[model samples]
Target: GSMRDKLLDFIIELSQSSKQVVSKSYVIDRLMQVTK
Candidate 1:
């Protein structure tokens, strides 16, 4: 788990498990919100 590859694992997880379509922008937005 490194680089953007870490994020890809998350993409696999979120895409399969959630009803919401998870995109890079969506992930980035959520990540920003959490850190803020």
Candidate 2:
């Protein structure tokens, strides 16, 4: 319902990356989210 949820969602996405390697394009997308 707020920014906290937004960041938590992003962190969840990041944790999922642990199953596989993080890719450059994916990282760029995440970075864009943080840049907001």
Candidate 3:
């Protein structure tokens, strides 16, 4: 997978896992909106 794909997966996993709180999780959604 490409860097962007890998990064997205990592962020998604972090967001999905409650134990690991990703403060910048909103960035993932924002990135999609901004990219679109």
Candidate 4:
């Protein structure tokens, strides 16, 4: 209902790299690239 959920939804809407491990840190990095 807020920023964290918004970010989670935003990230989920994007396609992820298959067969690769994704961590919270990785998500943060990806989010930076996305939001910019």
Using TM-score as the measure, the top candidate is: 3
Which ten contiguous residues of candidate 3 have the minimum total lDDT?
27-36
The per-residue C-alpha lDDT of model 2 at residue 29 equals: 78
Per-residue lDDT of model 3, residues 1-36, tens digit only: 465776787668767887755457785775656454
Which ranges of candidate 4 are over 4 A from the true structure? Answer: 1-21
Task: Pick out the ten consecutive residues of candidate 2 with the lowest summed lDDT.
Answer: 14-23
As for TM-score, the candidate ahead, 1 or 4, is 1
In model 1, the worst 10-residue window by lDDT is: 1-10
Better of 2 and 4 by TM-score: 2
lDDT of 4 at 26: 68
> What C-alpha lDDT values do all the predictions have?
0.65, 0.75, 0.65, 0.65
Clashes of each: 0, 0, 0, 0
Q: What are the per-residue Cα lDDT tens digits for candidate 4 across 1-33?
A: 566776877656554636345578866886776
**Stretches > 4 Å off in candidate 2:** 19-36
Candidate closest to the true structure, highest lDDT: 2
lDDT of 4 at 35: 60
Candidate 2 lDDT score relative to the true structure:
0.75
- The predicted structure with the larger TM-score, 1 or 2, is 2
State the lDDT of candidate 1 residue by residue for 1-36, as single tens digits. Answer: 354665676667786895755467877876665454
